[PDB]
Write a protein that binds this ligand. Structure first.
Ligand SMILES: O=C(Cc1cccc(Cl)c1)Nc1cncc2cc(OCCN3CCCC3)ccc12
Ligand SMILES: [Cl-]
Lengths: 299, 305
């Protein structure tokens, strides 16, 4: 019993965190094999190719714990700077660089000065921002998922938007969303609720004994999305319906049956009642997260 | 900017997790130096659970009855002793990954990170608080017994909790790392129930100061209150009494935001009187009590927005 927001064990990632310094800018780097990946704005009309051509390998001070790492080359890939170093990290895990879609969740290891300070779980929002907990110096903190024994790096933190939300890239330097890495006016679009995730969390509530929101009713996929579109909810596709299959099978509540409960939960509200200790409908637990936390999968 | 429930990086703790097996019972152990700590109910059959004599059950066991597994390597047990509700298995090898550690016992309201393990294998990490009724609201299944709660201040890991059982209401109970239970619980299958739970008041006030630091001020009011008048209203909403120590502890946050502790208490009384009214504080529609005054100061800084 119990449903908590749970992150992946951060150990395999901690052994990769280093501190990258260029001039006055100091942020975090990800040391995998003989390369250190970090946001390219560490070298900061910012023409990054023009700013990088003027730098030498000794300008980058990379520090792994209390040991300095020797930079022997550097290249830029989109918005990420790759610093080729002298030593290959002995603690390099089995890893993969993956790009995630909105709605997908991941673990963030928040770092300051190459030293891990906290770990938390979050979701890639439909408007491509993340609602993280970041301060100055957290740039270069990474988002990951653990796949059996292989770490999947999916996010690298770059900046904070005027609304307190965060923006970053995948590990190939490609931004998530319509953002650019510079001091300019940038705004996160209107956010929507991740529908498939709220439904997964309602199945998790049923599994944990919370059944008050259930009803005898059902709906069509078209009638649900017409109401969802009105409440700023992401459209529920047939793929989403299919993905919720195992939870539907385990609880005996058909997906469109659970959609009628969400429909009533949107028009009539919580009414002083809570679902899993929450007075709001939670959207940062995917259907897979619910299965993993309510089955005991380990790494 | 941004306020999240944050756990400590679990790495230093992961390198300590092992699987302890005695007969058919299989749970987790904490391997520090040449000793493996685990709940003493690993020697119990699910039968003896009602009224077991652990001294009598341990005297009948030998070192080869305990199968300790660190990864894919078996650890050889060369001695064993019991300290309250924890079993200490002396082993042949000292853990090379042993961190700088300390066993600490915490008070209700205190927060810590939990590394949930199954079969000596870490599966997840989450942050929680020791409830006023001494239970924890964790996310645990069968086999999670022996999972540990910790705080990593500076480079030292402070072990403060070891999971033992789940109560009828879904809440969890356990001991400090010296085998002493938190609360009036016993490691027996007798009828036990968690008392009435109360809200950790000093933590809600800390979280309201964190909200002010993150820009949200809508809940603030022009009123102040006495400590006695606040507690009379707090009691009525099932809130823990706010002591003068709590008032003192909230001093730095009071200084940083410019809102006196008793002024924030009036804003809190008004929230309990009126509700949230469709508004949210730090992305929450409920008043959050699992962030201590020390967590807020740690996660936030010294510049208010
Ligand atoms: O409690 C024990 C063993 C035990 C028993 C008695 C005394 C001691 Cl000292 C130790 N281990 C568990 C720990 N944490 C969480 C659990 C969750 C569990 O199952 C969720 C669903 N429950 C199915 C039965 C009602 C609901 C089962 C077991 C859990
Ligand atoms: Cl404490």
């Amino acid at each position: 019993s119990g449903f908590r927001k749970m992150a992946f064990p951060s150990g395999k990632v901690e052994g990769c965190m280093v501190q990258v310094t260029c001039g006055t800018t100091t942020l975090n780097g990800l040391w995998l094999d003989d390369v250190v990946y970090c946001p390219r704005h560490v070298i900061c009309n910012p023409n990054y190719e023009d700013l990088l051509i003027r730098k030498s390998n000794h300008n980058f001070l990379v520090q792994a714990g209390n040991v300095q790492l020797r930079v022997i080359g550097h290249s830029m890939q989109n918005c990420v700077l790759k610093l080729k170093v002298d030593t290959a990290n002995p603690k390099t895990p089995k890893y993969k660089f993956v790009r995630i879609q909105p709605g997908q969740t991941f673990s963030v290891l928040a770092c300051y000065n190459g030293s891990p300070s906290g770990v938390y779980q979050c979701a890639m929002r439909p408007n491509f921002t993340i609602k993280g907990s970041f301060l100055n110096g957290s740039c270069g903190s990474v988002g990951f998922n653990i796949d059996y024994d292989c770490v999947s790096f999916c996010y690298m933190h770059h900046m904070e938007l005027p609304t307190g939300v965060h923006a970053g890239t995948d590990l190939e330097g490609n931004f998530y969303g319509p953002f650019v890495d510079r001091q300019t006016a940038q705004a996160a679009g209107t956010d929507t609720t991740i529908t498939v995730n709220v439904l997964a969390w309602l199945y998790a509530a049923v599994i944990n004994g919370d059944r008050w929101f259930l009803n005898r009713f059902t709906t069509t996929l078209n009638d649900f999305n017409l109401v969802a579109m009105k409440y700023n909810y992401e459209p529920l596709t047939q793929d989403h319906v299919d993905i919720l299959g195992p939870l539907s099978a385990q609880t005996g509540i058909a997906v469109l049956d659970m959609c009628a409960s969400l429909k009533e939960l949107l028009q009539n509200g919580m009414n002083g009642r809570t679902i899993l200790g929450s007075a709001l409908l939670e959207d940062e637990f995917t259907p897979f997260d619910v299965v993993r936390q309510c089955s005991g999968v380990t790494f």
